[PDB]
Design a binder for these strands. Structure first.
Lengths: 346, 508
DNA sequence: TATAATGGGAGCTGTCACGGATGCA
DNA sequence: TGCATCCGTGAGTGCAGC
């Protein structure tokens, strides 16, 4: 029913490691990685492919999918070929395979055992724009990074090194996903810094600070305009479904006109404009009207150069420019005469 | 209705509360065999798929009542405070101390009254060496300094004049040594007193016996073989690289560590005994020791009558998963079925694809003639859906979404209002939730994430799709941060008084 | 990138009647 | 098989409404 409760149950299934269990798991993982590198040395194959194969057989055929980094599409066929190629190796070499498998299994068990930590850390990041479950999952990604990067040699407990990567992943997630209009992480940092600065400033000023005071507190490079624009780009959008009035019958989006699609008046005006221009078309001769339509882009929509209309009508560019000039001139005279195209100039 | 699954059940499978089984591979839960479309809990699926096992704590200072690799029956106490709830192969977890019994084969002399000595070519442990009517003083036949080496029972004297030993005497049980360590002894002074019956210690056996008769006495040169124990302490950061009862030689390492100086290396030939484990692991499994190269690696799943190790000699007894132990040099098969039981809309889509419509129509038709009214009713209700799909030409599995459509952007605008500020439809936020969760799912898959994580992610993905299509239909309605207002989904857009039909269609 | 850190947190209460399912006696 | 019982779905129109 409640997804969080359900997940907390599934987490409550796997029991917490002891110091020895943790050390052994970490050790098996590390030695497993070493073994994969050794198998890469022996076989002369790609360590990543080998790792994906060992992980494939450990996880089973229940999960097999093409890895973005891998060169070959990963399917039961290829993993069977590679597995059999790994079965083809001498006892001391074939040993490293067992080391690798044990490594993967240890990795899985390590993560699964440490899933509680992620929750305990993520519970404090709520209200920051991501759901609890999302924070948990991103924190889990962090946990995975921590597992693959851990060194048991340092004798530090796993939680210490894990917490860093977990917080890292949660915060990266918050910075990356939380805005409908996405903002770069460094810019999010700058914005949050501006917020904290303004909040401290207001905490000592007994009022909200001006742009100038914030600019002062931000240091050199920061003036009022920079603070103002930074606050401008930080603005988040509002819902179109935002309710208006005490009833349920009015949306905020109902008050917003469409500026894109031309109005009936605008459309009709463009229509009468085209029709009237064609009047003056039949007016000027065929050639000068066509030259004007080519140069102004009424024909294909592009505006031709003098050399193009000149090569088209078979005259010099000077000539075509001259007939364009006289065309425009006759149009000017006729326009002064009939005052027809004046009203379309607003 | 189509798959004959009650609302609660479909809820359980889609939302990952329970597994549903496909191609069971003959699993057995509580004595009853498993057949397709059965509802398995998490514990049940884990017991069936990954096998049954448990681990028990050992309080500080207490040792094991059982041995590593030893089969165990339910109820059998592994310790004074520990009893195993199941049957299977017990295994040691993190032994605190390693005892090494060192093999020593040496030569030692003794002199006894001829009347007392019972003549034998060899002496087994505990076997009486001699029977003495009166107290007898064994005397030194050499001069030098005394090295007294005391076993559990029985002793050794080594006389060294130059620091080079000139004598070795054996003192079996019943002889109380009259000398201390490092004592200076001249020739013919008593090193011991023999009283009553004297016999071989339990620790040492006499392999060979030579005897020289001189005067009224016999001098026995005994070729003896015995083991001397040495304890080693293992710290939590150390691991044992040697199996229970392993023959080791000088230079070999019993226990590794972080740094070489804290390592445990074997000084001499001896057998290894693992004592005081941190915990004991009881697994239901079949053990298969191997003398040579093994054909199957760790994690592989195998049926009875399968190749394991030694070029096809040792094979598989039960169904299970293969754990190859290099430390103990044994292939261990934890007993588990290969059963395929999935969760979520993938399972459901599979079952949907596997429905033959005509067949089910026939079934329900034969069901419609039943005397019971309820059965005819339910069969009618089902046959209505079945025949709906049949007549329409729609594939049932299309009720599952592989590819979620995306509305044209102009219908879910992002628009700059008068003041230059932006206003936008909720559908964008819903779609963003969806895409974030999907992408995170693909990355978690590609990176080989554990099953709990992937399960959580899939559940969240389904709920995301739900929120997109009909929000608040199942579970809490998705809201924007800092607001209690439910987001407006496609269903909301369509229906109601404010819906598309009534607002924009039947009136304008 | 390493002291250790290991199961959440807010609930929302004064309808009202019907159709339809589901369950339990 | 009949009867609790729980869940889900409805509950006038147009104005304006910040």
């Amino acid at each position: 029913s409640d997804p969080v409760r359900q997940y907390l149950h599934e987490i409550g299934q796997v029991p917490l490691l002891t110091l020895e269990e943790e050390v052994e798991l970490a050790r098996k993982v590390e030695e497993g990685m070493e073994a994969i590198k050794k198998l890469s040395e022996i076989t002369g194959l790609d360590p990543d492919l080998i790792r994906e194969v060992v992980r494939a057989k450990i996880l089973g055929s229940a999960r097999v999918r093409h890895i973005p980094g891998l060169k070959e599409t990963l399917d039961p066929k290829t993993v069977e070929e590679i597995d059999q190629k790994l079965k083809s190796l001498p006892k001391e070499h074939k040993r490293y395979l067992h080391i690798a498998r044990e490594g993967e299994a240890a990795r899985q068990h390590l993560i699964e055992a440490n899933l509680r930590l992620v929750v305990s850390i993520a519970k404090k990041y709520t209200g920051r724009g991501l759901s609890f479950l999302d924070l948990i999952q991103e924190g889990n990604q962090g946990l995975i990074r921590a597992v693959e990067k851990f060194e048991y040699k340092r004798r530090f407990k796993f939680s210490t090194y894990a917490t860093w990567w977990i917080r890292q992943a949660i915060n990266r997630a918050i910075a990356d996903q939380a805005r409908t209009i996405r903002i770069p992480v460094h810019m999010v940092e700058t914005i949050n810094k501006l917020s904290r600065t303004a909040r401290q400033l207001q905490q000592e000023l007994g009022r909200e600070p001006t742009y100038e005071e914030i600019a002062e507190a931000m240091g050199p490079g920061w003036d009022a305009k920079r603070v103002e624009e930074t606050l401008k780009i930080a603005q988040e959008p509002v819902s179109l479904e935002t309710p208006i009035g005490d009833e349920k019958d009015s949306f905020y989006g109902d008050f917003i006109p469409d500026e894109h699609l031309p109005s009936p008046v605008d459309a009709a005006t463009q229509s009468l404009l085209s029709e009237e221009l064609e009047k003056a078309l039949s007016k000027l001769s065929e050639r000068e009207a066509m030259v004007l339509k080519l140069r102004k882009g009424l024909i294909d929509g592009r505006e031709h150069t003098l050399e193009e209309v000149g090569a088209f009508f078979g005259v010099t560019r000077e000539r075509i420019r001259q007939i364009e000039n006289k065309a425009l001139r006759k149009l000017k005279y006729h326009e002064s005469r009939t005052r027809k195209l004046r009203d379309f100039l607003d | 209705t189509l798959l004959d699954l009650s609302a609660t059940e479909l809820e359980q499978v889609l939302y990952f509360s329970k597994y549903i089984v496909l191609d069971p591979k003959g699993a057995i839960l509580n004595g009853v065999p498993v057949e397709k479309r059965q509802l398995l809990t998490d514990e049940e699926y884990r017991e069936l798929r990954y096998g049954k096992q448990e681990t028990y704590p050992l309080p500080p200072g207490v040792d094991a009542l059982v041995k590593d690799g030893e089969e165990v029956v339910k109820g059998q106490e592994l310790a004074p405070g520990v009893v195993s709830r199941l049957d299977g192969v017990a295994l040691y977890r993190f032994p605190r101390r390693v005892r090494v019994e060192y093999v020593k084969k040496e030569r030692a002399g003794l002199r006894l009254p001829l009347a007392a000595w019972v003549e034998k070519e060899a002496y087994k442990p505990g076997e009486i060496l001699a029977e003495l009517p009166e107290p007898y003083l064994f005397r030194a036949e050499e001069e030098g300094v005394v090295e007294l080496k005391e076993l559990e029972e029985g002793a050794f004297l080594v006389l060294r004049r130059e620091d080079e030993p000139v004598a070795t005497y054996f003192l079996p049980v019943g002889m109380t040594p009259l000398v201390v360590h490092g004592e200076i002894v001249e020739k013919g002074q008593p090193l011991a007193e023999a009283k009553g019956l004297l016999r071989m210690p339990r620790q040492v056996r006499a392999a060979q016996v030579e005897a020289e008769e001189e005067g009224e006495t016999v001098y026995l040169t005994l070729f003896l073989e015995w083991t001397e124990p040495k304890d080693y302490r293992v710290q939590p950061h150390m691991n044992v690289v040697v199996p229970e009862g392993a023959r080791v030689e000088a230079g070999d390492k019993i226990v590794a560590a972080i740094d070489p100086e804290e390592e445990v290396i074997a000084e001499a030939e001896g057998v290894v005994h693992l004592h005081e484990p941190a915990s004991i692991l009881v697994v239901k499994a079949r053990v298969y020791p191997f003398e040579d190269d093994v054909e199957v690696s760790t994690g592989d799943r195998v049926a009875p009558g399968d190749v394991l190790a030694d070029g096809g000699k040792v094979k598989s007894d039960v169904y299970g998963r293969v754990e190859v132990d290099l430390v103990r040099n044994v292939v261990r098969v934890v007993e588990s079925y290969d059963i395929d039981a999935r969760m979520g809309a993938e399972a459901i889509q599979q079952l949907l694809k596997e429905l033959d419509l005509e067949a089910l129509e026939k079934e329900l038709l034969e069901e419609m003639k039943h005397p019971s009214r309820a059965r005819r009713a339910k069969a009618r209700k089902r046959l209505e859906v079945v025949r709906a799909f049949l007549d329409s030409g729609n594939r049932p599995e299309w009720m599952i979404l592989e590819a979620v459509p995306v509305l044209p952007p102009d219908l879910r605008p992002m628009v700059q209002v008068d003041g230059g500020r932006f206003a936008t439809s909720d559908l964008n936020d819903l779609y963003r939730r969806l895409i974030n969760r999907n992408n995170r799912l693909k990355k978690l898959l590609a990176q080989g994430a554990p099953e709990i994580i992937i399960r959580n992610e899939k559940r969240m993905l389904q709920e995301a799709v739900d929120a997109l299509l009909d929000n608040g239909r199942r579970g809490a309605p998705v809201t924007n941060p800092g607001s209690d207002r439910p987001l407006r989904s496609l269903t909301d857009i369509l229906s109601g008084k404010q819906g598309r039909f009534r607002q924009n269609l039947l009136g304008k």
